[PDB]
CSV table of C-alpha atoms and ligand atoms in Angstrom, one decimal:
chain,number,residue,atom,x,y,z
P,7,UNK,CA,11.0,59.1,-41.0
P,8,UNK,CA,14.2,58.6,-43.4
P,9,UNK,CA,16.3,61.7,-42.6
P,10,UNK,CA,17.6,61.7,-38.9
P,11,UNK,CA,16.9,65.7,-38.5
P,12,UNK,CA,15.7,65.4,-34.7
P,13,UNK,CA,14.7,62.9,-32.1
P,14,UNK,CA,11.3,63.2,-32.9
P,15,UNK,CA,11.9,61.3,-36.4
P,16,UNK,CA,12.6,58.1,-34.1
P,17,UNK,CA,10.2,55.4,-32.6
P,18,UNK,CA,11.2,53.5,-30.1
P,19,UNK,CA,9.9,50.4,-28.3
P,20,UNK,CA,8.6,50.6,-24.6
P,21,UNK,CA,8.8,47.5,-21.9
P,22,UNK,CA,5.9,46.4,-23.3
P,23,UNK,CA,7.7,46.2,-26.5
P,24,UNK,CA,5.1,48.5,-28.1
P,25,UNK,CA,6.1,51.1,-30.1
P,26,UNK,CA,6.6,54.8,-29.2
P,27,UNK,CA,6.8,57.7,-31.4
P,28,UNK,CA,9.4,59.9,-29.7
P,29,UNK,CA,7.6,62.7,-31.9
P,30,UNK,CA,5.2,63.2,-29.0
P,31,UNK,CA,7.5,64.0,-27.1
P,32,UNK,CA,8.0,67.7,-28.6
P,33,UNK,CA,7.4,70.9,-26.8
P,34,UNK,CA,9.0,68.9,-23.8
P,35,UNK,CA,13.2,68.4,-22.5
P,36,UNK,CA,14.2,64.9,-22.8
P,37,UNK,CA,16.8,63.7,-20.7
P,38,UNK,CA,18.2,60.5,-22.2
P,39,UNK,CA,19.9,58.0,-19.8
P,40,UNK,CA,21.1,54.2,-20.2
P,41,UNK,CA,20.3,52.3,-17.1
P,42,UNK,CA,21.7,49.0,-16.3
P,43,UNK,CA,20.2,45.5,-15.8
P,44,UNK,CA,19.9,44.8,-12.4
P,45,UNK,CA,17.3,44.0,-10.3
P,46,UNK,CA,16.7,46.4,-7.6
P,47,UNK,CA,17.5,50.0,-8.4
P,48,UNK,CA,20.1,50.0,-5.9
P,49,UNK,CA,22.2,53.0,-7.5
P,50,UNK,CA,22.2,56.3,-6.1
P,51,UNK,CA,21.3,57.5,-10.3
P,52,UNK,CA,17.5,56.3,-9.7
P,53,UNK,CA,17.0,58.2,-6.7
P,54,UNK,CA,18.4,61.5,-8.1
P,55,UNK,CA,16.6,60.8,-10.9
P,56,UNK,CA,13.2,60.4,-9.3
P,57,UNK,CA,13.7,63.6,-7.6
P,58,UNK,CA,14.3,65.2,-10.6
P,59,UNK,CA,11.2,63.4,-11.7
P,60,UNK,CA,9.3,64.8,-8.7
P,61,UNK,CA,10.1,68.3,-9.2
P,62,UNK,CA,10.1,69.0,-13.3
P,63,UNK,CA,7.6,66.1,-13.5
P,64,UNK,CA,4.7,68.2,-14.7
P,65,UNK,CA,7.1,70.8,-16.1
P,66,UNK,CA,8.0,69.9,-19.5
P,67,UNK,CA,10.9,67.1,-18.5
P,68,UNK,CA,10.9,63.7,-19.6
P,69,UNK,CA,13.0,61.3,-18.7
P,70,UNK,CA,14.1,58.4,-21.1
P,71,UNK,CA,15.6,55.7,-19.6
P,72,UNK,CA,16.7,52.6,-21.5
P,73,UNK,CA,18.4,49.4,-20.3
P,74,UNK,CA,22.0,48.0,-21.5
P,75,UNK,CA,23.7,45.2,-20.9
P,76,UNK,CA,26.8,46.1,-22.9
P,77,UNK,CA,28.7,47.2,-19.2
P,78,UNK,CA,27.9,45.9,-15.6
P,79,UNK,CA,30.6,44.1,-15.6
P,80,UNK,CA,29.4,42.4,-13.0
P,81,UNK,CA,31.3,39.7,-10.8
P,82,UNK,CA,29.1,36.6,-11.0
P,83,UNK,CA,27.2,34.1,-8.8
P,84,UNK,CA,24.3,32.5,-10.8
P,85,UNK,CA,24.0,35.3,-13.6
P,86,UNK,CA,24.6,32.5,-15.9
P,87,UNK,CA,20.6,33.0,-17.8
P,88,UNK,CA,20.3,32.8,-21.5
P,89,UNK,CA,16.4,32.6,-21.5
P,90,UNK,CA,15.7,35.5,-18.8
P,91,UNK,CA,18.5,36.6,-17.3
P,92,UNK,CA,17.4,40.5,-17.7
P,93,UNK,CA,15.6,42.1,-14.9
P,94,UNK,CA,11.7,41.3,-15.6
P,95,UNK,CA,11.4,44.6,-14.2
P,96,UNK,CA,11.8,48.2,-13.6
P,97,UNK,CA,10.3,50.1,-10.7
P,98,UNK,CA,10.3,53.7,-10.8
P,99,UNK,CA,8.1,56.7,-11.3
P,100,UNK,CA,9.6,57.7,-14.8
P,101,UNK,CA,9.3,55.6,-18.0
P,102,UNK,CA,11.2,52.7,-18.5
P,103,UNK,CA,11.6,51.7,-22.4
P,104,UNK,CA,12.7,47.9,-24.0
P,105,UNK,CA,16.4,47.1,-23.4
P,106,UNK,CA,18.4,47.8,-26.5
P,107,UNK,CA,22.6,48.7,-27.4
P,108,UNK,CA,23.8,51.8,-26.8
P,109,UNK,CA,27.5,50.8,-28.5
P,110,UNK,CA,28.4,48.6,-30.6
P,111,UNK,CA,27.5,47.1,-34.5
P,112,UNK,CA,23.5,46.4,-33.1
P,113,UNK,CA,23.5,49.8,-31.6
P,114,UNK,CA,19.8,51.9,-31.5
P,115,UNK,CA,19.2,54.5,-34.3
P,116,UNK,CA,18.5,56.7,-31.4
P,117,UNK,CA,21.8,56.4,-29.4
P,118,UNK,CA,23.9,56.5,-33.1
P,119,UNK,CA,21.8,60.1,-33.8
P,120,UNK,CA,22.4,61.5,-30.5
P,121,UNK,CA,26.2,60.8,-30.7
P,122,UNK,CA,25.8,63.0,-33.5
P,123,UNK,CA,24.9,65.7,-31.8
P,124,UNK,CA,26.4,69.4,-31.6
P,125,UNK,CA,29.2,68.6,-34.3
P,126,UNK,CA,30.3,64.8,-33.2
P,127,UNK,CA,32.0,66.2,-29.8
P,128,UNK,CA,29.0,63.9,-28.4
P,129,UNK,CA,30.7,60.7,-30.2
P,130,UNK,CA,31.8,58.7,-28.1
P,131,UNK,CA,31.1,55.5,-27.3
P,132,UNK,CA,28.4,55.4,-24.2
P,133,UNK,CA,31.6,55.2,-21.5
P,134,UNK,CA,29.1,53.3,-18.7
P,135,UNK,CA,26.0,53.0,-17.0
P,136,UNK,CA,24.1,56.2,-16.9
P,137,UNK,CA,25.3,58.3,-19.4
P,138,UNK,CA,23.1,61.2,-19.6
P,139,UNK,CA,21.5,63.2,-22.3
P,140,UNK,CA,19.8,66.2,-23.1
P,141,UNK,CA,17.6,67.1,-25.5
P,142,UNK,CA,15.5,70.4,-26.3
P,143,UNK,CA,12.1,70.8,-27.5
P,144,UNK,CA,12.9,70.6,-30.9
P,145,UNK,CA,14.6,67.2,-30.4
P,146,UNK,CA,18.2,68.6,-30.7
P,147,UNK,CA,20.9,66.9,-28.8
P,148,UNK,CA,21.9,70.1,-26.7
P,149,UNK,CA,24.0,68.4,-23.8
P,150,UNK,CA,25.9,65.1,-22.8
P,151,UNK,CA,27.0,64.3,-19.4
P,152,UNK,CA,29.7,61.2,-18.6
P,153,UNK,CA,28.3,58.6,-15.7
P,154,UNK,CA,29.9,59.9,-12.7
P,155,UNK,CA,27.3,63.0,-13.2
P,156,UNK,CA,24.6,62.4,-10.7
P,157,UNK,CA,21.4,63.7,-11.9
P,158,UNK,CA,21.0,66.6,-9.9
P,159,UNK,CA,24.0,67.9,-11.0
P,160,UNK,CA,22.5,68.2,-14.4
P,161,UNK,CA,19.6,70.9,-12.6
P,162,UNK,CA,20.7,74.0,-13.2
P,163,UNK,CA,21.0,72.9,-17.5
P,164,UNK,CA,17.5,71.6,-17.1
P,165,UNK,CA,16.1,74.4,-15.2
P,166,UNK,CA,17.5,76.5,-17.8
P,167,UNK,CA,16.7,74.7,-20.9
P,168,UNK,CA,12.8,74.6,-19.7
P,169,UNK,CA,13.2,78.6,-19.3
P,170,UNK,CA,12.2,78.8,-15.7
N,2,UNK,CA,56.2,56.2,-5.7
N,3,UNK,CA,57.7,56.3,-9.6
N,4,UNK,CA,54.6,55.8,-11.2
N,5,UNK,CA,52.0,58.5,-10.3
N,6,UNK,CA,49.3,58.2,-8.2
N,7,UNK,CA,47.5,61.4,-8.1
N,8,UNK,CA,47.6,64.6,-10.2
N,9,UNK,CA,49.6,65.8,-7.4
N,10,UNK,CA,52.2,63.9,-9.2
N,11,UNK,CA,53.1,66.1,-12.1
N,12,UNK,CA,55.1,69.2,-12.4
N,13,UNK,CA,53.7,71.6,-15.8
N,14,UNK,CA,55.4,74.7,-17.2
N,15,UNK,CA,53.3,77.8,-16.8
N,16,UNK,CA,53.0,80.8,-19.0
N,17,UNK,CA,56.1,81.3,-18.5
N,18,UNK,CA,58.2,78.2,-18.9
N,19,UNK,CA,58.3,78.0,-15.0
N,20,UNK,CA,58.1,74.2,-13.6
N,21,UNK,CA,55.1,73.8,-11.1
N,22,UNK,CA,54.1,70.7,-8.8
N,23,UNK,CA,50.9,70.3,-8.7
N,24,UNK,CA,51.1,69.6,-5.0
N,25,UNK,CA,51.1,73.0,-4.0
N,26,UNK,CA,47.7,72.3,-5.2
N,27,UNK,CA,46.7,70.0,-2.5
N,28,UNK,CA,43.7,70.7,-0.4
N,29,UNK,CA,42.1,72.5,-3.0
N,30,UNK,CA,39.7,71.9,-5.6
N,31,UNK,CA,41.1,71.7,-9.0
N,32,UNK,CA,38.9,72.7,-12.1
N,33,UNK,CA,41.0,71.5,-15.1
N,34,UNK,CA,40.0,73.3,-18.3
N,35,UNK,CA,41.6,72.6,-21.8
N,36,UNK,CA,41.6,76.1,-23.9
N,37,UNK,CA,42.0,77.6,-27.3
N,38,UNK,CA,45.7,78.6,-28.6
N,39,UNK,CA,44.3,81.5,-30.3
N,40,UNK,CA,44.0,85.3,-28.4
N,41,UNK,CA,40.7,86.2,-27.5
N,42,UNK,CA,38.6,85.8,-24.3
N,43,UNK,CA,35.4,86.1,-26.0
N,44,UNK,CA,34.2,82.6,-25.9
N,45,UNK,CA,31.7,82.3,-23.2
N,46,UNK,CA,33.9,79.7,-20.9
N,47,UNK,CA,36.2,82.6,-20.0
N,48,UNK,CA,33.3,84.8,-18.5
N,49,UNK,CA,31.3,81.8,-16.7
N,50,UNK,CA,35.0,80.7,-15.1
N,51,UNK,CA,35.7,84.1,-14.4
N,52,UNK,CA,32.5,84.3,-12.3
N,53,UNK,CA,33.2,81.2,-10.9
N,54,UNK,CA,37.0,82.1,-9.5
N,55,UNK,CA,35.3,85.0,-8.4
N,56,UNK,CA,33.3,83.1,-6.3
N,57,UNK,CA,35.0,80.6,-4.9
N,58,UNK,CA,39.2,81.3,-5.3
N,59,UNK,CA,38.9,81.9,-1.5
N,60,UNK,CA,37.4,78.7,-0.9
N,61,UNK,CA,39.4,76.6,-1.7
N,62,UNK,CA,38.7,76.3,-5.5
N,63,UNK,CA,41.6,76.7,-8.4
N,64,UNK,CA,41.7,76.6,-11.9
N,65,UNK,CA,44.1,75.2,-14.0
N,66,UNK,CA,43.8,76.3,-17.6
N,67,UNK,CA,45.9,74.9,-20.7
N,68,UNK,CA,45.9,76.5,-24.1
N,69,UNK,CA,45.9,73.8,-27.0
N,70,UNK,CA,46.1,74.2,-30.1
N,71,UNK,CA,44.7,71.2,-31.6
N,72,UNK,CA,41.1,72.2,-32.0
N,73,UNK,CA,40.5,74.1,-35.1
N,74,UNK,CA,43.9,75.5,-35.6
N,75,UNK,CA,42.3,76.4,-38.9
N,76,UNK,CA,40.0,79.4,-37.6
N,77,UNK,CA,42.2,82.6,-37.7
N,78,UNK,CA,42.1,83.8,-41.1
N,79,UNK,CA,45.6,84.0,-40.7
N,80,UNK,CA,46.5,81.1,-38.0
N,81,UNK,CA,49.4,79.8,-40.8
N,82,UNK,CA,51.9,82.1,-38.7
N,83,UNK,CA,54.1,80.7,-36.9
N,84,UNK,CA,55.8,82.9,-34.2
N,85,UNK,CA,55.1,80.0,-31.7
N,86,UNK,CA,51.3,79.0,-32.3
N,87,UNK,CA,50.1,79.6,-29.1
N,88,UNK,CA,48.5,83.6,-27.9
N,89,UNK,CA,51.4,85.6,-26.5
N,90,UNK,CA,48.8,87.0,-23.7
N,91,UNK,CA,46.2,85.8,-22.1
N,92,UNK,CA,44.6,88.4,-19.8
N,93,UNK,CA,42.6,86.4,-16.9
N,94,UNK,CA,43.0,86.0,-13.2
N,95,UNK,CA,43.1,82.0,-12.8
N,96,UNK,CA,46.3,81.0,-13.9
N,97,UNK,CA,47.2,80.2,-18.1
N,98,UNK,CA,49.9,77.9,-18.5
N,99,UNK,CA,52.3,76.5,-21.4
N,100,UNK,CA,50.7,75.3,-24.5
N,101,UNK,CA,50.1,71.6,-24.1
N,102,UNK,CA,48.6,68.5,-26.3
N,103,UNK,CA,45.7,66.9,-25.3
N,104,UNK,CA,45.6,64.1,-27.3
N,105,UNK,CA,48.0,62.2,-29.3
N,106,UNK,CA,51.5,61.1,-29.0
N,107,UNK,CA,52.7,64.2,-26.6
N,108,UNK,CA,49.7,64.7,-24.8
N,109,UNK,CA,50.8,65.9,-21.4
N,110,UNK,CA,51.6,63.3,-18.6
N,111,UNK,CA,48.6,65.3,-16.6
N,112,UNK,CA,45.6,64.7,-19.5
N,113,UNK,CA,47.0,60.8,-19.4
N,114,UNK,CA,46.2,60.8,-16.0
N,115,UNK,CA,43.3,62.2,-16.2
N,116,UNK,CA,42.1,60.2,-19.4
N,117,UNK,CA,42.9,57.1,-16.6
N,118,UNK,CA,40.2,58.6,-14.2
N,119,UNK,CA,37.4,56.2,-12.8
N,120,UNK,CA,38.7,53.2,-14.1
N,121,UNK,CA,38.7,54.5,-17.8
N,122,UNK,CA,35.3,56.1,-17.6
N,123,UNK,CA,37.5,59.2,-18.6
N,124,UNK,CA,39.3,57.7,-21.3
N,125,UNK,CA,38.0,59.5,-24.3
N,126,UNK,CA,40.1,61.7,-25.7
N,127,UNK,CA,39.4,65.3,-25.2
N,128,UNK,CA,36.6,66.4,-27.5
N,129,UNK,CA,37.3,69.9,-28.6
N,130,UNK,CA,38.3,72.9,-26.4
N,131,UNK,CA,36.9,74.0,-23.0
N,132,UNK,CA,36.4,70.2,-22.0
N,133,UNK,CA,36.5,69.9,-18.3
N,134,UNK,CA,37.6,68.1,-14.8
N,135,UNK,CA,36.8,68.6,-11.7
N,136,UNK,CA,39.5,66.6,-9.1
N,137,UNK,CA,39.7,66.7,-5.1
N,138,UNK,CA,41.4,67.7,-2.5
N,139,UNK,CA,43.5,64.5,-2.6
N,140,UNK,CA,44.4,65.0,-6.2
N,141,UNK,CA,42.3,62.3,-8.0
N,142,UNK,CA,39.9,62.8,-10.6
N,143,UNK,CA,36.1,62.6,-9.8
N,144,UNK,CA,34.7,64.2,-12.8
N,145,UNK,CA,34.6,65.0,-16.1
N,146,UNK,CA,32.6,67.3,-18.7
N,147,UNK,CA,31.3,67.7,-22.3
N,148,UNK,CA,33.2,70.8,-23.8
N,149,UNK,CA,29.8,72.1,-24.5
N,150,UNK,CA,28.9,72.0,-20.5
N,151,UNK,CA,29.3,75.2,-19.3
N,152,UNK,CA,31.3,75.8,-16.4
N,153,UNK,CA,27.9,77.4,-14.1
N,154,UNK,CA,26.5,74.5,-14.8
N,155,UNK,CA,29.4,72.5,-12.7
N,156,UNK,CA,29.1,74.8,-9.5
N,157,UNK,CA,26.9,72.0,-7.8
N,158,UNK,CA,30.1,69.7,-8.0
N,159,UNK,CA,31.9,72.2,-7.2
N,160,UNK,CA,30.5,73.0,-3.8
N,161,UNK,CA,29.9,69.6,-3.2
N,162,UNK,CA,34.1,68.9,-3.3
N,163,UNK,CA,34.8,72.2,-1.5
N,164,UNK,CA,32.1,70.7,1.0
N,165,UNK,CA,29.2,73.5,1.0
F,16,LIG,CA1,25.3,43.0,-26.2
F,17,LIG,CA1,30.1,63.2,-9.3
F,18,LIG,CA1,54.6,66.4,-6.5
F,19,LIG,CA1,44.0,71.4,-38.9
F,20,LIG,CA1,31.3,65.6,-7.5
């Protein structure tokens, strides 16, 4: 809409660069995390996260996952690509969405908003790759986790904040 | 070894202006917890780390909590006094030690450190009270917490260092 009250005000684009009201996404725990560029998945994050997939799948989690370039600094070796240079792809069970800024003056409404959340002690800049987020039903940022979280270790607020 | 290496490094005063090296720490888990000046155990950190040291003191888990009072030193309707700044008592069984900053120019030696933690990933100055770290047996730190994550919620971690 105009007046960032929840998540659900926000529509983001999808790797098929077609929009996606995050509105639908009510009744339901988002779990907001910035994966990075690569091709191949290689981090231990995906896994975990798959798991977490597996299990709260068809429980009322959602997982969010959007890809950033701002970090990675990775050490080159022919990364040198300004015409498709990010990966073409992104294999894995949960939804994938269209690269966009986490940080930074082009940063995504949605990213600003949740750094908003509970009070501003969620404002800081996204540190690294795999930041991780959670929202509640209502599309209120209720928790912020720093990179070197894994996943899993994020259970026991999921579990709690789908009330099983 | 001038410059430090690990949070084994540093020597802190304790509740009562006692020195303490940190080394008598090593081969135990440290949780690191940043808490309110003011008197009053009734936020919920104090009960969920309570239950935790409970749990796990004789396991190889310790917790090292510092009041700071630069977090809403506005709240008592009368905070104004100045008799020190900082609650006379503190009634728990894990260790209180001296008042401390976090942030700023006199933040302690040990939250410098420990803002230095996975190559800067942990730079962000501490967000409010009850912000939390996690370091190993070895004295480095491994992670880090929101203020609003609450301290059940980092058991998984937990075991995981104290290998269970
Ligand atoms: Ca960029
Ligand atoms: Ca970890
Ligand atoms: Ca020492
Ligand atoms: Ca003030
Ligand atoms: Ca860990």
């Amino acid at each position: 809409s105009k007046n960032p009250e929840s998540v659900h005000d926000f529509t983001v684009k999808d790797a098929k660069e077609n929009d996606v009201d995050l509105s639908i996404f009510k009744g339901k725990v988002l779990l907001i995390v910035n994966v990075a560029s690569k091709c191949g998945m290689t981090n231990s994050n995906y896994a975990e996260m798959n798991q977490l997939y597996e299990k709260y799948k068809d429980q009322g989690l959602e997982i969010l996952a959007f890809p950033c370039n701002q970090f990675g600094e990775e050490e080159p070796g022919t990364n040198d690509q300004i015409t498709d240079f990010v990966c073409t792809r992104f294999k894995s069970e949960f939804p994938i969405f269209d690269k966009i800024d986490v940080n930074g003056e082009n940063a995504s409404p949605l990213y600003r908003f949740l750094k908003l959340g509970k009070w501003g002690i969620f404002g800081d800049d996204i540190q690294w790759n795999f930041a991780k987020f959670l929202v509640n039903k209502d599309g209120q940022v209720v928790d912020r986790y720093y990179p070197t979280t894994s996943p899993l270790s994020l259970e026991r607020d999921i579990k709690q904040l789908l009330e099983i």
